[PDB]
Amino acid sequence: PGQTGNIADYNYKLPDDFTGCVIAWNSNNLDSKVGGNYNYLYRLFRKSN
Amino acid sequence: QCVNFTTRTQLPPAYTNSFTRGVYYPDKVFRSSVLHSTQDLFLPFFSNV
Amino acid sequence: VVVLSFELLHAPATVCGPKKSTNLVKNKCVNFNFNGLTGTGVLTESNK
Amino acid sequence: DYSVLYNSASFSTFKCYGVSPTKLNDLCFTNVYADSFVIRGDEVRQIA
Amino acid sequence: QNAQALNTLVKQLSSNFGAISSVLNDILSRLDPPEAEVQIDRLITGRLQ
């Protein structure tokens, strides 16, 4: 947080201070399977932020 | 009709002065009994026109 | 690329958001909104 | 209605100078200049 | 002297000390609290000064 958007606001947000830190890495080796990795979902609407 | 000659003299114009002109309410916000000074374009007094 | 440029309350505004206007009550210490300007104060008629 | 515009997706970059997405639908606008043009992929950062 | 010092003290509130605006109410209504605290800080420094 500090760079807000829509997807993060849709599904999961973090406190402004945000102690600790985050690491992001690609998973295209396994996640981008040909069959379609449809198990990943998220909430578009929940009546409020 | 374009580069024709009119019936003018050879422009001996005067340079009269108004001594108070050119104040035009620079801002639309109402002010009552305020000595606010503004930096904006104006016509100075005693100006030769 | 679309670039939006604008100014805030420099003059009588003509474009506003989806805010729905409510009725005004005088002589009551209430929050007041007017085209974006906010705060807390009582609203009274002024003959100026 | 800036709300629906922000509800849209696929924005290469979306930064607001002096305003915020939620406050966009709150304050009134004197006037706007919705400038429109097009540039290539790398030139997006050359804006601002 | 007291009135002169008091009056110029009041007029200081019209200076934003480098912030976006010299009024707190507009700033809060104009920016997110994780994005406007970096501006209200300048006001509460100059005003404190």
Describe this structure in words.
This is part of a larger assembly, with 5 copies of chain A. Chain A is low in regular secondary structure and 49 residues long. The longest helix of chain A is centred in the first third of the chain and has 5 residues, at 7-11. The two termini of chain A are 14 Å apart. Chain A has one helix at 7-11. Chains C and D meet through strand 1 of C and strand 1 of D. Strand 1 of chain C pairs antiparallel with strand 1 of chain D. Chain D: It comes from Severe acute respiratory syndrome coronavirus 2. Chain D: Residues 40-42 are annotated as: Integrin-binding motif. Chain D: This is Spike protein S1.
Chain-wise SSE layout:
The structure is cut from a larger assembly and holds five copies of chain A.
Chain A: H1 7-11
Biggest interface, chains and residue tallies: C-D, 21 and 22 residues
* SS summary, helix count of chain A: 1
Note the main sheet of chain A.
none
Overall 3D form of chain A: flat
Distance between the termini of chain A: 14 Å
What's the gyration radius of chain A in Å? 14 Å
Percent helix among the residues of chain A? 10-25%
Helix/strand order of chain A, N-terminal first: H
> So what's the oligomer here?
part of a larger assembly
Would you tell me the structural class of the helices and strands of chain A? little secondary structure
Provide the β-strand percentage band of chain A: under 5%
Number of strands of chain A: 0
Protein name (chain A): Spike protein S1
Organism (chain A): Severe acute respiratory syndrome coronavirus 2 (2019-nCoV)
PDB class: viral protein
Keywords: SARS-CoV-2, Spike, double deletion, viral protein
